[PDB]
Design an enzyme around this catalytic site. Structure first.
Site, short mmCIF file in Angstrom:
data_model
loop_
_atom_site.label_atom_id
_atom_site.label_comp_id
_atom_site.label_asym_id
_atom_site.label_seq_id
_atom_site.Cartn_x
_atom_site.Cartn_y
_atom_site.Cartn_z
N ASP A 293 0.85 -1.18 0.00
CA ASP A 293 0.00 0.00 0.00
C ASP A 293 0.89 1.24 0.00
O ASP A 293 1.93 1.26 0.67
CB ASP A 293 -0.91 -0.01 1.24
CG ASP A 293 -1.96 1.10 1.20
OD1 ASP A 293 -1.58 2.29 1.24
OD2 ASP A 293 -3.17 0.78 1.15
N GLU A 340 1.26 -0.79 -5.29
CA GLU A 340 -0.01 -0.11 -5.06
C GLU A 340 0.29 1.34 -5.39
O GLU A 340 0.71 2.11 -4.52
CB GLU A 340 -0.44 -0.24 -3.60
CG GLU A 340 -1.80 0.37 -3.29
CD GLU A 340 -1.84 1.86 -3.53
OE1 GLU A 340 -1.19 2.60 -2.77
OE2 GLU A 340 -2.51 2.29 -4.49
N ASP A 395 -10.42 -0.85 0.19
CA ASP A 395 -10.66 0.50 0.68
C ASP A 395 -11.75 1.18 -0.14
O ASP A 395 -11.97 2.39 -0.03
CB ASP A 395 -9.38 1.35 0.61
CG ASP A 395 -8.34 0.91 1.62
OD1 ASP A 395 -8.71 0.66 2.79
OD2 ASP A 395 -7.15 0.82 1.26
#
Length: 500
Positions: A293, A340, A395
Site C-alpha cells: 500500500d 499499489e 478501501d
C-alpha cells in the site's frame, strides 16, 4: 516479471464463512480455494494477516511479521481435547471484534493450557522448532504482546522507561515473570503460520498463487518499532518525531495525517535494508505475490511533524527505492512485489516501479469520473500488461454500492464505454459483472475481483470505508453464498477472455 494472463479473487480470511463469528484458516478456506480453482481462478488476494489492535484494521498491526490469531482455526484444537468451544452467539456475515476479542483470546489461552497438557512431543517439538526458527522476530513480538497486555493494553512507548527503552534486566525479569504469556503468543503465532502453511500448499496444489499485502509504513505501537527505535524517527520517549501521510489536494485541503512512524532510510540503508529484506523474506514465505500500500513511499515520502494535527506543515523526502530494490532483487533474484500506485504518483515513482518490472494497479470505479484520458480505462493500460485491474479494492465500496452512489455522468459514461467493449447490462445488480467482465477483456495480466462483487452486494457489504470510525473489516461470507453458479459464471469469462 511474468504474471500469466489470468484472474484472481480478493477475499480476506475474516470474510470467510465459519462458525464462531469469523473467518479462519480452516477448510472453508480450502473450499474457497476449490471454488476459486473451479471458477478457473489462479490467484487469491488477501489483506495483511498481522495482529490487530483497536480499529481492527490489518494495516495498523502490532507486528510486521506476526500473524493474526483471530484467523486461527480453533476447532482443530478442540478436536484434540485442548479447548471447549462455546459461542456467545456471533452474528452472520459480520465480524464482531468486540465479542471475538473477549471470546477468542480467552478461548485461546485455554487451548494453550490444553496444549501443554495433552500435547505430544511431536507437537511440542514442532512448536518449539517454530520458536527457534522464527526467533529474530518472534521473541520481540511475544514479549511485546505479553508486556502490552500486562500493562493494561497500553502503547509500548508509555510503558515504564526501563522496558520502553528495552533494558537488559527489565527485558529479562519481565520475560521471566510472563514466561507463560510469552509461550502463549508464540503458541498463537505457531498455530497461525502452521495452518496458513498448509492452506498455502492447499492452494499450491489447486494451482493457485496467493497475493499478500503489506503497508509500507509500520504501526507506531508495534513490536518492531519498540524493538528497533533506531530505525524510526522517534524521540527518546518513543513517540514519533514525525509521522506519515499525504499532502493536500483538491479533495483534502488539509491533507492526511496517518500518524504512522517514518523510516530513517539513512540507517536502514547502512544496515543493508535488513528490515525489509527480512520483511519480504517472510512475505515470500506466506504468499507468491505481495502488494505494498502507498508504493510511492519508496521514491519519496511526505514527512509530517508529529505535533501537527494535519498534513499541511508537511514536506517531501526522497527515499532509497532504487537502492532498496537492488538489494531485494539480489537477495531473492526476483522482486515479486505488486505495486499499489493508485492516487497521484510522480514519474520518479513510475520509473522505479517499471525499472524492476513491478506490476501496478488499475481500479475501474475511478475510470468514469472524467474523460477517455482516464488512466483507469482498459484502453489506457500499458502494453506489457504488467498491471492489475480491480473492480474496486478493499478501501472501496462494493461496485454495486458504488454504482448506487456514482455521479450520473459516471453511470452513463460507463454503459457508453462498456458498449464500446461489447459489454451491456440491464439490472443494476448486473453492473458488478459488467465492469468485472470489462476488467478481463483488458490487456491487464491479472484481474483480481473482490468477493463482494462476485455476489453483487450493496454498500452494506463494504469492507473498509476510509474515514468511518468502525464497522470496517467486519463483513463476512454466508454459507454457500458462493454457489457453483457464480463460479461457472466467472469461469465463463475467464475462458471467453483467454485467462485460463
Amino acid at each position: 516479471m511474468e504474471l500469466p494472463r489470468a484472474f484472481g479473487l480478493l477475499l480476506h480470511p475474516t470474510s470467510l464463512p465459519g462458525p464462531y463469528g469469523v473467518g479462519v484458516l480452516g477448510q472453508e478456506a480450502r473450499d474457497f480455494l476449490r471454488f476459486l480453482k473451479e471458477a478457473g481462478g489462479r490467484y487469491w488476494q488477501v489483506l495483511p494477516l498481522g495482529p490487530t489492535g483497536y480499529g481492527d484494521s490489518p494495516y495498523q498491526s502490532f507486528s510486521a511479521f506476526a500473524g493474526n490469531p483471530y484467523l486461527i482455526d480453533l476447532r482443530p484444537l478442540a478436536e484434540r481435547g485442548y479447548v471447549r468451544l462455546e459461542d456467545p452467539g456471533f452474528p452472520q456475515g459480520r465480524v464482531d471484534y468486540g465479542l471475538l476479542y473477549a471470546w477468542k483470546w480467552p478461548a485461546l489461552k485455554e487451548a494453550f493450557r490444553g496444549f501443554k497438557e495433552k500435547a505430544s512431543p511431536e507437537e511440542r517439538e514442532a512448536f518449539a522448532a517454530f520458536r527457534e526458527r522464527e526467533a529474530w522476530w518472534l521473541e520481540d513480538y511475544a514479549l511485546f504482546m505479553a508486556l502490552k497486555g500486562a500493562h493494561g493494553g497500553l502503547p509500548w512507548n508509555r510503558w515504564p522507561l526501563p522496558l520502553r527503552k528495552r533494558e537488559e534486566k527489565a527485558l529479562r525479569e519481565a520475560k521471566s515473570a510472563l514466561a507463560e504469556e510469552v509461550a502463549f503468543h508464540a503458541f498463537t503465532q505457531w498455530l497461525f503460520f502452521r495452518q496458513w502453511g498448509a492452506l498455502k500448499a492447499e492452494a499450491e496444489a489447486l494451482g493457485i498463487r496467493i497475493i499478500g499485502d503489506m503497508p509500507i509504513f509500520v504501526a507506531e505501537d508495534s513490536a518492531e518499532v519498540w524493538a528497533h527505535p533506531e530505525w524510526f524517527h522517534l524521540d527518546e520517549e518513543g513517540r514519533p518525531t514525525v509521522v506519515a501521510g499525504v499532502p493536500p489536494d483538491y479533495f483534502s485541503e488539509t491533507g492526511q495525517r496517518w500518524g504512522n512512524p517514518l523510516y530513517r532510510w539513512d540507517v536502514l540503508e547502512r544496515e543493508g535494508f535488513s528490515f525489509w529484506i527480512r520483511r519480504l523474506e517472510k512475505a515470500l514465505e506466506l504468499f507468491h505475490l505481495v502488494r505494498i500500500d502507498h508504493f510511492r513511499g519508496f521514491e519519496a515520502y511526505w514527512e509530517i511533524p508529529a505535533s501537527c494535527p494535519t498534513a499541511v506543515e508537511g514536506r517531501w523526502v526522497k527515499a532509497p527505492g532504487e537502492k532498496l530494490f537492488q538489494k531485494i532483487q539480489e537477495v531473492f533474484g526476483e522482486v515479486p512485489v505488486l505495486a499499489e500506485d493508485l492516487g497521484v504518483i510522480t514519474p520518479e515513482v513510475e520509473a522505479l516501479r517499471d525499472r524492476f518490472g513491478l506490476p501496478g494497479m488499475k481500479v475501474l470505479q475511478f475510470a468514469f469520473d472524467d474523460g477517455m484520458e482516464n488512466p483507469f480505462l482498459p484502453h489506457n493500460y500499458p502494453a506489457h500488461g504488467r498491471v492489475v485491474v480491480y473492480t474496486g479494492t478493499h478501501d472501496n465500496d462494493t461496485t454495486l454500492g458504488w454504482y448506487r452512489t456514482a455521479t450520473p455522468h459516471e453511470k452513463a459514461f460507463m454503459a457508453r464505454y462498456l458498449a464500446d467493449w461489447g459489454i451491456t447490462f440491464r439490472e443494476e445488480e448486473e453492473v458488478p459483472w459488467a465492469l468485472m467482465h470489462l476488467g478481463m477483456k483488458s490487456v491487464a495480466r491479472l484481474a483480481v475481483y473482490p468477493v463482494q462483487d462476485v455476489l453483487a452486494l450493496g454498500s452494506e457489504a463494504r469492507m473498509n470505508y476510509p474515514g468511518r470510525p468502525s464497522g470496517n473489516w467486519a463483513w463476512r461470507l454466508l454459507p454457500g453464498e458462493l454457489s457453483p453458479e457464480h463460479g461457472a459464471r466467472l469461469r465463463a469469462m475467464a475462458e471467453a477472455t483467454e485467462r485460463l
